[PDB]
Amino acid sequence: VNKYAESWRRHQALWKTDKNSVLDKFKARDPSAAQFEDKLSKYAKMATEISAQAKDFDQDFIRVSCHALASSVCDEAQAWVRAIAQTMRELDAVTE
Amino acid sequence: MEGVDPAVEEAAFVADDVSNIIKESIDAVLQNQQYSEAKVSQWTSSCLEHCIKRLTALNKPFKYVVTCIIMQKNGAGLHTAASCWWDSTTDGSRTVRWENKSMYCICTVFGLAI
Amino acid sequence: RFLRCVDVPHPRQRVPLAEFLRRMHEAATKDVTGSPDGRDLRAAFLAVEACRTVILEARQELLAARAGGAAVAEWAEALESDLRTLYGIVNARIDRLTAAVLHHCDEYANDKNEIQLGHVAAFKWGVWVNTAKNPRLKAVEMPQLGVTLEIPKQIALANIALRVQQRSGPGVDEYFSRCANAWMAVGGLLAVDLLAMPPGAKKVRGWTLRQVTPLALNVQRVPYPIPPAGADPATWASEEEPPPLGVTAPLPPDVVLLEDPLQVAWWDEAHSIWNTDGISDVAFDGASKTFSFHTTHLAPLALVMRRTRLLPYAGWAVRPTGGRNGNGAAISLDVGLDAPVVIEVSKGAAWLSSPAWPQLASLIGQPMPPLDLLQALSDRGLHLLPEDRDAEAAGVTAKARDTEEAMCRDLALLGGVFLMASSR
Amino acid sequence: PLLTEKDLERSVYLTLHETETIFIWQATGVTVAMDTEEAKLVEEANRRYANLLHTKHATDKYVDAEAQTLVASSQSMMVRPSAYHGQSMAFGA
Amino acid sequence: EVDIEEASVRPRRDPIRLVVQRRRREFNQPNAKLADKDAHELWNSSQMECRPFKDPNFDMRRMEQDVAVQAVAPLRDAATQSTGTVPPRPAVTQTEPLDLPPEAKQDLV
Amino acid sequence: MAEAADFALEPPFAQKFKASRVKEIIGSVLVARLSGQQYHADNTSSWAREIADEIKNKLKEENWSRYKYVVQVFIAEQRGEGVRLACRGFWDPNTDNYAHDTFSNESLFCVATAFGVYLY
Amino acid sequence: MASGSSKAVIKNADMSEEMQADAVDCATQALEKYNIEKDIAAYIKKEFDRKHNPTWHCIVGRNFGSYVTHETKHFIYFYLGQVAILLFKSG
Amino acid sequence: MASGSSKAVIKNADMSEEMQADAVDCATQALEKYNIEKDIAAYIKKEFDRKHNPTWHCIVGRNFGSYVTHETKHFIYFYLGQVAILLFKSG
Amino acid sequence: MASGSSKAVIKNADMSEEMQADAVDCATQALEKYNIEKDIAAYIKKEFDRKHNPTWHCIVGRNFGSYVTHETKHFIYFYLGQVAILLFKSG
Amino acid sequence: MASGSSKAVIKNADMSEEMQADAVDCATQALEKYNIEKDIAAYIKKEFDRKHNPTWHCIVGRNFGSYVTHETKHFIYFYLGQVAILLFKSG
Amino acid sequence: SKAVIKNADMSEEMQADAVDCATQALEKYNIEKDIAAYIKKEFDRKHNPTWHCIVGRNFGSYVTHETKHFIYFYLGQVAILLFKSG
């Protein structure tokens, strides 16, 4: 059970990495729309993978519900997605 | 002059016939043509096609390789040399150069028995 | 059909049937010049049998056809389109097989220089190639089709090939929806085709050089006569009718002379009729059922009877046989023939009772639907399924289909209860 | 598997294909035979091209313009029935 | 116009395809002895030359030239089909005992 | 001597004519022979012969069995002559292959071509 | 003839609604006129190149797996009965 | 490519107007006369070599960002239908 | 591990021989490392976007028909044993 | 800031081998300088206008066919990454 | 017990293979279930699964089989049925 629980920590970066710092570093390089789309698609695909992996795991005589954990990590990835579109729309508004 | 076996000659490289084929193919496309950079590629293609069609019409158990180079006449010197590794009992090769007041056309044909 | 597990889609599978059809066509037209795959007779005979089955089903569905009116009309048009596609596929497959065979003549040659190949399925096929150019050979006999041919000096002096193809049985004739005025094929179709020599292979030191040819992809057809060693049969021809090829072939043993006088014809493709002209010495040996004729035009050949030979039928007289109520009948027909043809019919199925000819014995006493009974009779060859272009040819008022069918149903409501008679 | 006698006797089909015209080298040759009116024409073309160079150099005739040529997600799809079950059974025993 | 209907290279005929067939046992000839033939050996057959002539020496300062630009060659539409067996055929199967003829039984009798 | 039963008509993929390897061989020969070399009509024919011999020797050292090698070397002075060089063949494309390379300096330009035709 | 248009079930679509409807209809005609998957894909691809500017790419079949890059709002993948149809605009 | 006419979206035209109309016309005839990008480029180049004092350079393609010099009143870039074309006199 | 290299049956290829061999090797690695067709396609596409740059498209399957537009010398459709692999550059 | 993982294939060049090496180096430097192919071509053009007998028009792009009257001893055509470059002089 | 081929959409060689495999299964086993299991697994190993095998003396079946992938025969008085599907 502990090994299964620790296996979910391979995605710990989503909730342990500073979104503000990562976004500032990404934006300081004058990122292209291609890189924006790449990051958005990467976060979306990891979110979809977590949602698909939101399943009950039966270890011997104990079942394990990752529904709350997987939902939380998917929400984290969706927030990662949202705070890219927010910057992009603000830039578009300034230009317009 | 002893009589060559017709069966051997059917699968033997005939340098004279290959040279005649090359000369006629060159003359059919370039005998009365002055050098033209636009049409030189089509001329080379036509010469290669004529050489290939005549070699195939010869109907011998030989894979045929035809190369054609057309260079403009301006005083530039061109020198060629070929070294090959093959069974020299049946196969063969032939190089023919033709010229007008405008171009040099060098065609080399290799026939290699299957 | 489902129990039989038939290898082809029924005509009631329009899109799947058409896809199967042209994928048959792609298989038949596939390039097999460099492999012996196309040199197998069964590789073509399989498609031939498949197409025969589809032709049988399509003819069964079309004879009944021959909002609802428009639907049945387009269904018919689809049926004849399928039939034409099947004929084309069969022809292309046979041409591919023969082309693949002749593309290796250097290996298929025999000691005699006269190559004789045959195969009988329904359909008999035979090819004879005379590369010997023997001038004294005037008679060629092929037992694989049972045919004897008195040939002219042209074949004796020239090197050609000759293909004889006899299609017999159900669904083998097309010149009833293809013919124009009064002709049809009887006893099957005999396609005789002259063939020029395709470019053969060259053998050098055991190596065999083989070049791709359109003749190697498919074969062509050459009409009569044969060039006298250096002419052009396709364009040039003897202005006088060339020495007529006497073709004595075994007619299927279920056909008796009904055309008076007996006639054999070559299909006048340019005229859409059966050209009896140039087809001389028309004889029929009934002791062995063999039709002999001297032909000056090599093309689809057949014994031919007039589509108006029995038209109009002199009268009909149908009695009840189903007892008190309507459950059976027996019709005696004076169709312009000697014996009054008596058919015992009953609910769903009809069977001949007289004449009791052994040629028709397979249907005498055979309880099976009257439509397919007349279909099987026409398979031997009988004008029992007439057309309007045959009625007006015979010179009688072709009853309009609506009136005819309404009258049919009105009398059939009365069938086993009343007595019916023909009105002159 | 070792080839048998019938395999050895079998005639192996080999196919030869004619290749296309394979152009190898096209030197950007710069000459025409000045002994010929062809090179007279090409030389007057060369001098008119030099005149074009001079005219371009003459005045403010080098102005250019911008060309902002502005003219991509990778999705994974799967197509499977994924329903197989090998099952054995005895009947009526 | 005529510039390209001259410059363009179009094949004048289809490629010629030949099939050579021989018995499998006829292959693997041990007499096949590939040998070296240098250009000095092929001097009379392959090693040619075009000597630069000095008296005419008609080389000119050609200044205008055009080059056939392709970049990415025109994209080709490709139709690919992956199919297995031709559509399956049904079957009728029923168990039925098989027995020898009474004629054969009486023969054994 | 190998019998016809085990005689493989097609060369092993390790023994197949490697177009990239022949490109590398031809380029190495051209660099070793013509880099920094000025055109010399008396020396050009000998240089072409040496280049062809070296390329053929390297192809032999590659030791691809039953692969006949044909090497052709063109070396010409760069006086600006319009040159159109092309080739066209008729063989079995499944086993036979080709390669070529070009070198050019301020004085001369050369094209060295090697064809490997499989023997059966 | 009966309208044998099976219920189109859309799995993955980065499209507009009218584009999805057009794709469903085009796939319906493609299946009605052709059962060969490459012919179906060719019909759909040429129809949508004419309608919505080249180049589209169509893959039709029953057993396959793909990983392709598509233009935004230019991607669809669905079933029409038992047949899998994929369309994507790229290049 | 081949067509009867196409919309030349001119991003910039260092031209006179009549000779812009000439450019539209010549590119139009090139479209139906030829079927290759290089072909259309050469057709336009020869058209203005005959009309407007050679030599002109013409580029036809799909996706290419370039920067060139030319002579004033003799430059244009336009996405003619499905092909972008850069046409400019520069000697 | 036995080197059960299923001989690739090149059905239709427009590339060079060396790059076709590289494609065969990449497909062999893909089938060695994965067991899902989408995984095979993703591996091949990523490998060839690292080698020959995006964009590539790979379809792995056994029952499919495709009609796609590919860049010249950037196409292959073959069979690695019973596995059909299609690769083409577009985008 | 950008670069291509494809060996520079110089299809043809009317300029010396070391000149072409300098051209490849300049193209690479342009790639690391800019992300827009227009600016890639612009920087290559300005570099070889200040270095290599101006004016060297540069065209960088994937697919395009053209004729240009390049000044002699002043032309190269080479594929790099996924963009072909026509780097010639006509000024 | 000679194999009595009742129905065959097959080739000759792999008909002989089917006969040999069925003979081996009958030699090694005594239950029709096990014989069918052996036949099916061997033919999956040899001839591109998926196959299906039914062994017994009392059964009537109607199945759809791939072309050249169907046989129904008798070994002695035991009926063995093979057909490839899925």
Side-chain angles (χ1 to χ4, degrees):
Chain A
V1 172
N2 289 119
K3 284 172 178 179
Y4 183 74
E6 193 70 19
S7 79
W8 282 88
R9 300 207 187 164
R10 66 196 173 187
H11 314 295
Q12 75 193 336
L14 284 176
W15 71 79
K16 293 184 178 174
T17 301
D18 186 21
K19 296 184 176 94
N20 298 339
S21 186
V22 171
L23 289 162
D24 291 333
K25 292 166 185 162
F26 188 51
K27 202 170 191 171
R29 299 178 181 191
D30 196 30
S32 68
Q35 300 170 340
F36 274 118
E37 179 175 30
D38 174 54
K39 275 184 168 274
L40 287 157
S41 194
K42 176 191 171 186
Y43 284 114
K45 66 93 179 177
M46 65 183 73
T48 58
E49 288 165 5
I50 293 149
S51 65
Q53 288 173 37
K55 62 92 176 179
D56 283 329
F57 170 73
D58 292 354
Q59 182 51 237
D60 308 313
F61 57 98
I62 297 169
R63 62 90 167 170
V64 176
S65 177
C66 291
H67 295 94
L69 174 73
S71 190
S72 308
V73 187
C74 191
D75 296 329
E76 272 303 301
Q78 188 57 42
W80 280 97
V81 172
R82 286 177 284 239
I84 294 167
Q86 200 40 64
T87 78
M88 184 177 177
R89 61 180 279 176
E90 284 144 359
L91 290 148
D92 308 326
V94 165
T95 306
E96 275 283 350
Chain B
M1 291 145 198
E2 69 272 14
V4 187
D5 193 350
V8 174
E9 200 164 60
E10 284 174 353
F13 189 91
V14 187
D16 289 325
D17 290 347
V18 169
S19 195
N20 294 336
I21 279 175
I22 295 161
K23 287 162 187 166
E24 296 156 48
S25 298
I26 291 171
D27 284 310
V29 189
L30 293 183
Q31 189 179 37
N32 302 115
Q33 296 294 338
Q34 302 298 319
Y35 184 79
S36 170
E37 197 70 44
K39 196 65 178 177
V40 70
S41 303
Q42 176 51 49
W43 286 334
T44 316
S45 192
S46 298
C47 292
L48 290 166
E49 285 178 9
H50 293 91
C51 289
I52 285 283
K53 70 163 66 64
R54 297 192 57 155
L55 293 162
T56 47
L58 298 179
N59 285 278
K60 302 203 173 199
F62 277 72
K63 300 175 173 186
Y64 293 107
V65 176
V66 189
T67 75
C68 173
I69 176 166
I70 308 178
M71 61 80 71
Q72 191 185 2
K73 281 186 167 194
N74 66 335
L78 161 64
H79 310 257
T80 179
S83 198
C84 317
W85 159 264
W86 86 102
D87 192 305
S88 302
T89 67
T90 58
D91 308 334
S93 61
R94 185 61 168 236
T95 309
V96 171
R97 187 195 99 197
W98 184 92
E99 66 186 288
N100 51 13
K101 303 290 106 176
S102 66
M103 65 183 73
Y104 282 111
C105 179
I106 303 170
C107 290
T108 313
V109 163
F110 312 90
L112 282 73
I114 310 159
Chain C
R1 190 183 216 266
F2 193 73
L3 311 180
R4 279 175 281 153
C5 288
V6 178
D7 56 348
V8 294
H10 205 276
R12 275 75 155 264
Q13 319 183 21
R14 305 316 309 158
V15 180
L17 164 71
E19 288 151 333
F20 161 88
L21 277 151
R22 86 287 185 275
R23 186 212 34 74
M24 293 297 103
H25 195 52
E26 299 145 11
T29 51
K30 196 261 173 190
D31 191 354
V32 286
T33 47
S35 55
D37 304 332
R39 303 198 267 158
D40 180 73
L41 310 187
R42 186 51 183 163
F45 269 82
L46 273 155
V48 170
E49 301 309 275
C51 292
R52 293 178 65 88
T53 53
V54 189
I55 280 152
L56 181 141
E57 291 155 346
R59 289 218 58 83
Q60 289 166 329
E61 303 309 318
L62 170 61
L63 184 62
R66 259 190 163 181
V72 73
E74 55 89 13
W75 165 239
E77 308 317 303
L79 288 150
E80 45 261 32
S81 69
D82 298 330
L83 291 170
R84 300 175 275 251
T85 56
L86 294 152
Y87 308 149
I89 289 165
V90 171
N91 302 329
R93 182 58 210 95
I94 300 307
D95 298 338
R96 191 86 209 74
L97 158 68
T98 45
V101 166
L102 299 162
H103 182 73
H104 311 71
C105 280
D106 58 307
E107 300 171 353
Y108 277 113
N110 50 2
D111 54 356
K112 298 204 308 182
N113 308 323
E114 295 172 10
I115 307 163
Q116 183 176 0
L117 305 173
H119 191 312
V120 180
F123 164 69
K124 306 177 181 66
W125 156 91
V127 171
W128 189 71
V129 180
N130 183 22
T131 60
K133 285 176 57 170
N134 173 36
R136 73 191 63 83
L137 198 42
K138 300 298 184 294
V140 178
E141 299 77 23
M142 183 177 177
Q144 297 92 61
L145 281 80
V147 183
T148 66
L149 304 100
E150 291 86 0
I151 73 168
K153 190 71 202 292
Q154 310 161 343
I155 317 173
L157 273 184
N159 162 30
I160 66 147
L162 196 143
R163 179 168 52 175
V164 176
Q165 289 154 121
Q166 179 171 345
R167 286 84 66 212
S168 301
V172 310
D173 189 15
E174 47 192 0
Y175 316 120
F176 194 79
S177 298
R178 281 194 56 189
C179 202
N181 55 5
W183 278 130
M184 65 183 73
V186 178
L189 292 175
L190 197 68
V192 55
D193 304 327
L194 310 167
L195 315 172
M197 295 298 102
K202 193 188 177 193
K203 294 178 178 165
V204 181
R205 286 202 197 161
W207 284 106
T208 300
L209 294 87
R210 200 177 302 286
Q211 280 188 348
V212 168
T213 316
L215 278 80
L217 288 178
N218 275 322
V219 302
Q220 51 89 32
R221 258 76 174 196
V222 167
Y224 207 64
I226 297 89
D232 193 353
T235 67
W236 179 87
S238 50
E239 295 317 307
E240 52 94 14
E241 274 197 349
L245 177 57
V247 176
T248 295
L251 196 69
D254 53 344
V255 177
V256 182
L257 286 187
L258 266 191
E259 170 59 276
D260 207 0
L262 73 165
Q263 296 268 16
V264 178
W266 73 278
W267 171 250
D268 219 349
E269 174 59 33
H271 309 63
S272 75
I273 62 168
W274 272 104
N275 203 8
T276 49
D277 307 335
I279 318 298
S280 43
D281 295 334
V282 181
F284 165 72
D285 184 12
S288 73
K289 255 62 177 165
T290 59
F291 60 108
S292 290
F293 63 96
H294 267 264
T295 182
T296 77
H297 322 266
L298 294 198
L301 290 156
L303 191 78
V304 286
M305 61 79 71
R306 275 318 191 174
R307 293 196 317 217
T308 79
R309 167 79 163 74
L310 321 172
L311 291 194
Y313 316 127
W316 38 267
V318 62
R319 87 197 177 205
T321 66
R324 173 160 176 77
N325 305 295
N327 295 314
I331 177 165
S332 163
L333 273 155
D334 185 6
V335 291
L337 278 181
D338 46 355
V341 181
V342 177
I343 301 99
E344 173 55 39
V345 193
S346 303
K347 306 174 293 298
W351 47 100
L352 187 54
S353 62
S354 43
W357 302 330
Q359 297 82 3
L360 307 181
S362 63
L363 304 178
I364 303 151
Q366 169 76 36
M368 71 76 88
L371 184 141
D372 282 334
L373 194 73
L374 304 164
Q375 160 69 258
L377 288 150
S378 63
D379 284 331
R380 304 184 187 88
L382 291 170
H383 197 94
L384 306 178
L385 298 174
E387 279 161 312
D388 286 323
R389 82 168 179 265
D390 296 325
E392 267 90 6
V396 293
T397 49
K399 302 287 105 172
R401 317 286 82 193
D402 54 356
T403 312
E404 168 173 337
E405 202 175 82
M407 187 66 203
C408 289
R409 301 188 190 177
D410 287 2
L411 294 182
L413 294 166
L414 303 174
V417 188
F418 272 66
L419 276 186
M420 283 73 74
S422 162
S423 296
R424 54 198 177 170
Chain D
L2 271 296
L3 293 189
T4 70
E5 184 65 21
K6 60 187 179 295
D7 311 306
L8 295 187
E9 204 64 35
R10 197 261 185 278
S11 292
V12 181
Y13 293 84
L14 297 174
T15 313
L16 300 191
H17 294 89
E18 161 174 5
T19 77
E20 72 286 332
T21 295
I22 305 152
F23 292 96
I24 313 173
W25 171 243
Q26 181 183 3
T28 60
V30 297
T31 191
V32 187
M34 311 76 78
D35 290 342
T36 300
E37 65 91 19
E38 189 191 6
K40 301 298 107 180
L41 302 159
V42 185
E43 163 58 36
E44 67 182 1
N46 294 330
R47 78 178 65 256
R48 90 168 74 103
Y49 191 76
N51 301 330
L52 286 167
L53 292 155
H54 304 338
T55 53
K56 264 78 175 183
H57 279 302
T59 178
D60 276 335
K61 201 170 73 175
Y62 279 157
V63 174
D64 311 329
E66 67 178 0
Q68 64 183 177
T69 64
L70 320 177
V71 301
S73 66
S74 48
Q75 292 207 41
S76 179
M77 302 65 88
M78 188 66 204
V79 180
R80 280 278 87 73
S82 279
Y84 282 152
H85 284 318
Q87 293 204 7
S88 194
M89 185 64 72
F91 306 77
Chain E
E1 306 187 324
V2 190
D3 290 326
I4 293 173
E5 283 89 7
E6 295 184 343
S8 77
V9 194
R10 258 66 167 167
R12 301 181 162 194
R13 60 162 184 79
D14 55 349
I16 291 161
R17 185 251 199 183
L18 170 81
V19 176
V20 295
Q21 62 190 91
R22 198 173 191 190
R23 301 178 187 184
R24 174 67 161 98
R25 77 195 309 132
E26 293 188 55
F27 293 86
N28 202 19
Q29 302 210 357
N31 293 337
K33 290 170 185 176
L34 309 189
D36 282 298
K37 288 289 164 189
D38 283 355
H40 79 270
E41 297 187 79
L42 303 175
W43 184 281
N44 297 315
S45 66
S46 297
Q47 179 148 9
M48 281 325 98
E49 54 178 43
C50 292
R51 288 295 187 187
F53 39 85
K54 271 68 65 179
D55 302 331
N57 62 25
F58 45 84
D59 50 352
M60 183 278 288
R61 56 96 173 175
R62 203 160 85 190
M63 187 66 203
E64 289 183 354
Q65 273 162 11
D66 305 335
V67 178
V69 172
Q70 297 85 18
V72 162
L75 280 77
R76 330 187 171 179
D77 286 27
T80 73
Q81 185 68 21
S82 57
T83 56
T85 314
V86 294
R89 207 262 305 162
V92 185
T93 47
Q94 180 71 61
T95 53
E96 58 89 20
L98 73 164
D99 191 77
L100 275 177
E103 200 277 331
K105 297 180 187 182
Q106 191 60 39
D107 287 342
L108 294 174
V109 169
Chain F
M1 161 85 188
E3 295 192 310
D6 271 354
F7 166 67
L9 274 296
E10 55 93 23
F13 190 81
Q15 295 193 11
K16 194 170 184 166
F17 191 92
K18 287 150 201 160
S20 47
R21 178 52 192 150
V22 182
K23 300 294 187 291
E24 295 159 9
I25 284 163
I26 293 169
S28 77
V29 176
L30 285 190
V31 168
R33 294 305 196 128
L34 301 166
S35 284
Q37 291 288 341
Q38 82 299 328
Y39 175 81
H40 204 274
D42 310 295
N43 306 354
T44 309
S45 179
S46 64
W47 290 346
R49 159 169 82 74
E50 290 157 58
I51 291 165
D53 295 334
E54 188 179 319
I55 295 170
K56 177 202 56 166
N57 291 323
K58 285 177 170 175
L59 290 176
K60 290 149 50 199
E61 294 147 19
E62 290 284 318
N63 282 278
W64 301 333
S65 73
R66 285 195 285 141
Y67 264 107
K68 313 174 177 183
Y69 305 121
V70 168
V71 181
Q72 180 65 256
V73 179
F74 292 165
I75 317 185
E77 182 182 1
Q78 278 190 58
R79 289 200 182 177
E81 75 281 17
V83 185
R84 171 65 271 171
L85 160 64
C87 70
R88 194 163 169 132
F90 168 75
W91 61 69
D92 198 319
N94 305 286
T95 59
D96 315 330
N97 202 0
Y98 64 91
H100 65 279
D101 215 11
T102 58
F103 164 85
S104 57
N105 55 35
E106 293 82 5
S107 68
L108 64 94
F109 78 94
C110 165
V111 189
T113 315
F115 292 165
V117 177
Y118 201 60
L119 171 61
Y120 300 112
Chain G
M1 294 299 291
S3 54
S5 185
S6 294
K7 180 67 174 66
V9 185
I10 314 302
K11 273 72 177 175
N12 193 2
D14 177 31
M15 281 325 317
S16 67
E17 290 82 4
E18 61 86 20
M19 271 325 307
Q20 288 184 50
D22 184 23
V24 163
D25 291 331
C26 183
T28 305
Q29 287 106 28
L31 280 175
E32 286 167 351
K33 316 182 304 299
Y34 293 100
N35 275 303
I36 288 192
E37 290 84 355
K38 75 174 170 64
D39 298 332
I40 294 154
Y43 167 81
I44 299 166
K45 188 261 193 185
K46 74 171 191 283
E47 274 303 289
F48 287 158
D49 278 358
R50 178 190 50 72
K51 291 169 179 179
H52 323 293
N53 172 332
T55 306
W56 294 87
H57 310 285
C58 191
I59 296 90
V60 177
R62 176 66 259 181
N63 292 266
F64 57 98
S66 61
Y67 186 89
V68 303
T69 285
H70 71 86
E71 290 177 44
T72 315
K73 288 292 160 215
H74 296 92
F75 169 85
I76 196 181
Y77 160 66
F78 57 98
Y79 293 101
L80 194 63
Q82 301 184 229
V83 182
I85 295 153
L86 169 65
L87 169 78
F88 70 100
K89 198 180 176 171
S90 190
Chain H
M1 61 66 58
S3 71
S5 190
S6 297
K7 277 74 69 177
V9 179
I10 304 170
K11 274 74 67 176
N12 190 294
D14 198 353
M15 294 296 173
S16 70
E17 211 286 327
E18 55 88 19
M19 191 264 278
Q20 292 167 195
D22 295 343
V24 168
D25 292 331
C26 76
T28 295
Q29 289 98 24
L31 291 205
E32 68 259 12
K33 176 71 197 67
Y34 291 163
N35 302 313
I36 301 169
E37 288 178 349
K38 176 263 291 177
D39 271 27
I40 296 154
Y43 190 108
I44 290 155
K45 164 162 182 171
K46 300 318 154 193
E47 278 275 327
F48 291 169
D49 284 12
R50 168 199 80 248
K51 289 156 140 178
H52 310 118
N53 189 359
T55 308
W56 296 69
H57 321 288
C58 180
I59 302 94
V60 183
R62 310 293 166 172
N63 187 359
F64 53 101
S66 165
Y67 180 60
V68 304
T69 57
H70 67 82
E71 72 170 13
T72 55
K73 300 287 100 178
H74 299 93
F75 162 88
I76 187 172
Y77 182 76
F78 50 99
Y79 204 111
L80 178 72
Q82 281 198 355
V83 297
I85 308 190
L86 167 60
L87 158 69
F88 63 101
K89 197 178 135 164
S90 184
Chain I
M1 186 66 204
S3 48
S5 182
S6 291
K7 300 288 96 175
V9 189
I10 309 302
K11 301 302 187 180
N12 187 2
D14 178 33
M15 294 183 286
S16 62
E17 293 188 352
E18 176 194 2
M19 184 177 177
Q20 282 181 46
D22 182 26
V24 168
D25 303 346
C26 177
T28 306
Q29 304 152 35
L31 282 71
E32 287 160 350
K33 297 158 194 177
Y34 302 108
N35 302 305
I36 305 168
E37 268 90 354
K38 70 99 174 175
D39 282 323
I40 310 297
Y43 175 91
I44 293 169
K45 195 251 199 177
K46 291 160 188 179
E47 284 306 288
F48 292 158
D49 290 355
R50 183 184 48 71
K51 296 169 188 183
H52 322 111
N53 314 297
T55 307
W56 284 96
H57 310 287
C58 187
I59 296 93
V60 181
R62 305 164 187 253
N63 290 258
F64 64 94
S66 79
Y67 186 83
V68 304
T69 305
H70 71 79
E71 274 184 50
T72 292
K73 300 301 167 208
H74 289 90
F75 174 82
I76 193 174
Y77 164 53
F78 60 98
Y79 280 68
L80 209 69
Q82 300 185 31
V83 181
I85 303 158
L86 158 65
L87 172 77
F88 72 101
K89 179 182 168 171
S90 187
Chain J
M1 184 177 176
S3 287
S5 176
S6 179
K7 295 175 285 294
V9 180
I10 304 166
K11 308 289 202 298
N12 190 359
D14 191 358
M15 65 181 288
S16 175
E17 262 184 347
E18 202 272 343
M19 295 298 102
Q20 303 163 39
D22 312 334
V24 174
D25 306 331
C26 168
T28 55
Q29 299 142 18
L31 300 166
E32 292 99 11
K33 282 185 177 69
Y34 301 103
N35 268 338
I36 308 102
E37 56 182 2
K38 155 198 50 182
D39 300 335
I40 308 306
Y43 168 72
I44 299 160
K45 174 174 194 308
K46 68 186 267 283
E47 171 166 334
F48 291 167
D49 294 357
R50 67 176 178 262
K51 281 164 55 183
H52 276 47
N53 321 118
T55 69
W56 281 60
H57 324 273
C58 185
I59 305 98
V60 167
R62 300 164 173 281
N63 184 292
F64 55 94
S66 160
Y67 283 171
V68 299
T69 297
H70 71 84
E71 311 201 25
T72 53
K73 300 305 148 188
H74 301 114
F75 151 77
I76 180 177
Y77 160 48
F78 58 107
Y79 208 96
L80 184 52
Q82 286 203 0
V83 289
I85 308 102
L86 270 297
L87 168 56
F88 74 102
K89 164 211 192 197
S90 175
Chain K
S1 298
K2 172 62 182 66
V4 187
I5 314 291
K6 299 294 181 177
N7 304 117
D9 180 24
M10 281 325 317
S11 79
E12 53 90 12
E13 186 182 355
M14 60 187 268
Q15 280 187 215
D17 293 351
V19 172
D20 294 342
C21 181
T23 302
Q24 298 161 31
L26 279 150
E27 289 165 355
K28 301 165 193 177
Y29 292 164
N30 295 314
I31 296 92
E32 295 99 7
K33 166 190 166 79
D34 307 331
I35 293 160
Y38 177 94
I39 287 173
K40 198 268 201 180
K41 68 171 182 58
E42 280 299 298
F43 291 160
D44 289 352
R45 188 181 63 84
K46 298 175 185 177
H47 299 290
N48 304 320
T50 303
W51 295 87
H52 315 281
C53 179
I54 297 89
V55 180
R57 310 169 193 198
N58 298 109
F59 62 88
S61 68
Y62 192 102
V63 308
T64 296
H65 58 79
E66 303 184 19
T67 308
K68 303 184 182 179
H69 294 87
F70 171 84
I71 194 165
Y72 168 49
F73 57 96
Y74 272 70
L75 271 167
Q77 308 213 15
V78 172
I80 302 156
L81 170 63
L82 182 63
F83 82 106
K84 174 172 173 171
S85 186

